[PDB]
Amino acid sequence: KVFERCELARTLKRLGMDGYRGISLANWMCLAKWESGYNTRATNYNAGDRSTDYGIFQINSRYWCNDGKVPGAVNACHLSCSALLQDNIADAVACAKRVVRDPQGIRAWVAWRNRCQNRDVRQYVQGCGV
Numbered sequence: 406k407v408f409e410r411c412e413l414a415r416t417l418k419r420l421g422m423d424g425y426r427g428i429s430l431a432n433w434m435c436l437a438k439w440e441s442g443y444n445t446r447a448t449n450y451n452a453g454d455r456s457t458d459y460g461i462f463q464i465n466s467r468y469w470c471n472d473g474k475v476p477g478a479v480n481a482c483h484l485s486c487s488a489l490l491q492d493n494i495a496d497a498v499a500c501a502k503r504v505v506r507d508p509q510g511i512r513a514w515v516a517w518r519n520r521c522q523n524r525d526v527r528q529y530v531q532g533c534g535v
Contacts, residue, residue, distance in 0.1 A: 406492035408443040408461070410434070411533035418535045420498040426505050433501070434529035435521035436514055437461050445497070446490050460489035462501050462514075469500055 408416070414434055417423070423430040440463040441447035449458040456467035456475045464482070466472045470489055471480035482500035489497045504513045511517050 406445045408437075408445075410443070410529070411535075413437065413443050413461075414530050414533040414535045416494060417498065420495060422498060422501075423535065425502055426510060428505060428511050429526075430535055431526040431529045432511055432517070432521060435524070435526045436511070436517045438529065439516045439520045440514065445492055445494060448490070457486070459486045460497050461494055462489075462497055463516075464489055464497065464500055464504065469504065 414430060417433050418430055422428070422433050437443055440458075441461050443461060445461045447458075447460060447463065449463060451457065451465075454467060454475070456465050456478065457472060458465050459470060459472075464470060466475050466486050467478050469480065469482045470484045470486040471478070472486040482503045484496055484500055489500065491497075505511055507513065512522075
């Protein structure tokens with residue numbers, strides 16, 4: 406599924422993402438936007454280490470979900486990577502929360518650091534009623 410901006414914002418808010426560990430909704434939106442263009446079936450293979458980025462938040466199988474094909478990997482979110490490819494983003498949100506429960510917080514995603522950190526992200530939620 407490819408979410409429309411405000412559609413995703415309300416969806417994320419309903420799933421309890423607004424302020425989760427101090428992270429505003431606009432940050433989560435800026436992340437999903439640059440990570441997958443709001444596409445839940447987005448995937449990006451990394452030939453370098455054989456891992457794959459899954460879903461709307463491009464969560465990596467080397468560490469977060471199990472897909473059984475990375476020679477040496479862990480499954481910190483305790484989910485099959487398939488779970489991160491559903492139109493329903495609840496499981497992906499549960500994993501996204503798990504990622505930020507670690508020290509870096511929202512900084513886990515390099516894309517967030519380069520394209521959202523210290524930026525005006527209001528644009529991502531304006532007019533969405535969130």
